[PDB]
Design a protein around this ligand. Structure first.
Ligand code: NI
Length: 154
């Protein structure tokens, strides 16, 4: 049942061409949420596939069963320990959003690479889904770590 999840992670990763860094089965145990979001960079709002696992966020370009087997092209990853997430209020337009107007969005800084971007969901409910999952992943990760220091004598 634990191993079955690892096998699913391995399957997913095999559909992502251009994978960089450690394997999903080395650092993750499950996929918590996946979905399409708009990612903002200079002169680009681009649709990207986002995947939140325990310990890792990954974003990819979606390829339109594929002919060659791969369904996504790797774009980036963030260890959730170095991922700083902040809310963006609707209507905000500033240098963090590359001059674009944000609705149903949020900002992510990756402090391992000193890179940032803004994400937008299509609806408020979808933003709340993403934020809730981001909070749950952090809470669980902090709950594990601490639990394992509080379980020092057991
Ligand atoms: Ni900043």
């Amino acid at each position: 049942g634990e191993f079955e999840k690892l096998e699913a992670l391995e399957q997913l990763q095999s559909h992502i061409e251009g994978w960089e860094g450690s394997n999903l089965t080395d650092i993750c145990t499950q996929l918590l949420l996946q979905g399409t979001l708009l990612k903002i960079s200079a002169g680009n709002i681009q649709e990207r596939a986002f995947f939140l696992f325990d310990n890792l966020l990954v974003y990819c370009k979606r390829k339109s069963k594929s002919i060659n087997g791969s369904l996504y092209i790797f774009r980036g990853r963030i260890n959730t320990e170095v991922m700083e997430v902040e809310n963006v209020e609707d209507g905000t337009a500033d240098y963090h959003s590359n001059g674009y107007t944000v609705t149903n969005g949020w900002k992510i800084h990756n402090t391992a690479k000193n890179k940032w971007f803004v994400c937008m969901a299509k609806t408020a409910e979808e933003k709340q889904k993403w934020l809730d999952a981001i909070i749950r992943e952090r809470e669980q990760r902090e709950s594990l770590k601490l639990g394992m220091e509080r379980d020092a004598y057991v």
